[PDB]
């Protein structure tokens, strides 16, 4: 998964991420809440006020209205209830033995000149018996003194800030300067409660995220090395530490995210700065009204241009990346996966297709994950391989080709093929998968899509209608009661079956259990399913399709004109080809995808070509 961290598995890494997000949002105390609500209801026509940028960078004399920043009067309680719902309670000064200042929210403040407006939340997570089990440190970074955020233009302010982070280790030393003594008290408190460094989660967003990287960098030498083994997840940070400790999460179109290289100001800092970085998630797109709009994108992309900070806002971090976490596709992803997250206002969502525009970013490689919202989305996949997730709402999908998985989710969902139904083949395994194969051979596996919309240029049956709506049934595609019949198939059971294709060619659906699939002289598509399946070509131009936890399969009689298709399988890195997954065991080629494998019986590895092994 994209948020894998150290050596936690997929699941623990996800629980870790979800906690980092919760304590990070808590540190802002709903700063952007009224703004996010306004954008969601109305769109981004009014753009983004300079006052919001200065608030994000400099903090607030709170809590209440600020010009151009709509204020939710329940900002504070909403935020506190939320962090608690996530399992976290602020720890008091008194619990810490800390002699310094906390305000009425229980927030802690920086300790040295230049750092006194810096903020941090110290939170505890407790088991059902009320024993402390984890400590959360959520940095809320500031630039320093507020009156310095209006002395020049907002663009000068931003530009000067960035140029100041690297010289004299300003960004590196930040947490040591601001919170050096507080963090000593945290060590003592951790130890008295039987916690070590591994039980501490450190997070924060922005200058907060810059603080997370600072603390990582300081963790080896300060506080007796106690936090060296701590968990560091930083959101939308301009900087990256020189350790291997920090998971730097951000949107690729967030102009603050990765603005600096380490903490070094470069020629790209004020432009597009989308070079790959080891600690970073490089290719997560926030598909919001700005990213989507030609008008908003007229000016060159730059942090110095305030509208672009729309993609920096913390509410869309929490909302969008939680949907990644909840995704059915989550365990297919990895750190550099291209993930497009539906982040449009209610107005834009009605008429805008969520798609990878690849705007202001290096060329996206490998498969694309598009994650919808819980409302009605319009989702467009590209001509390569796509994983499209509708979630709730009535969603409409389009896709331009390749191999795809399309998950309608709850609701009444539609796949609009934009082409004649005569250019497609439809198969159905009776277990909720409808397969859609285009005229070039590209297969989509679809679930929970009840309508297919075709475009017929000629009259269908003499009967029907440029756009034509077919209803997906157990027995075929229905218009009223025209049938487009499913391709011929043989279906098994969830036990061990032998299935035999007819000479004409059959989709063979093994399903669960260890199946024996006997193709014939014709063109078969083999779907062994779960279990360890033995699949025999039997002649023809055959396709073998692997999805999910497909087991340990054996393929017999594979030739040049046959094709393997791996779609929604484990262990695939962007632009892996088959060689990355291939080895010889005896006279057999073996392809491994996580703990699943295909053995090509009697096939020499050197005899194979990438064109017959599709890795999506
Ligand atoms: Ca990128
Ligand atoms: Ca596609
Ligand atoms: Ca949806
Ligand atoms: Ca849906
Ligand atoms: Ca079976
Ligand atoms: Ca099977
Ligand atoms: Ca065959
Ligand atoms: Ca199998
Ligand atoms: Ca063949
Ligand atoms: Zn306990
Ligand atoms: Zn056999």
TrEMBL record:
Residues that, per the record, bind Ca(2+) 9: 511, 513, 515, 528, 530, 533
Residues that bind Ca(2+) 1: 117, 143, 152, 156
Annotated positions binding Ca(2+) 8: 502, 524
Ligand binding (Ca(2+) 3): 277, 280, 282, 336
Parts forming coiled coils: none
Short name of any one Pfam family annotated for the protein: HemolysinCabind
Cellular component GO terms, alphabetical: extracellular region
Binding residues for Ca(2+) 6: 391, 393, 395, 408, 410, 413
Binding residues annotated for Zn(2+) 2, in chain numbering: 516, 536
Binding-site residues for Ca(2+) 11, renumbered to this chain: 529, 531, 533, 550, 553
Chief place where the protein resides: secreted
GO MF terms, alphabetically ordered: calcium ion binding
Protein residues bound to Ca(2+) 7: 493, 495, 497, 510, 512, 515
InterPro entries in alphabetical order: AB_hydrolase_fold, Hemolysin-typ_Ca-bd_CS, Hemolysn_Ca-bd, RTX_toxin/Mannuronan_C5-epim, Serralysin-like_metalloprot_C
Ligand binding (Zn(2+) 1): 127, 131
List of residues binding Ca(2+) 10: 520, 522, 524, 537, 539, 542
Keyword annotations of the record: Calcium, Metal-binding, Secreted, Zinc
Record localization: Secreted
Record: residues binding Ca(2+) 2: 252, 274, 282-283
The protein, known as: Lipase
Upper lineage: Bacteria, Pseudomonadati, Pseudomonadota, Gammaproteobacteria, Pseudomonadales
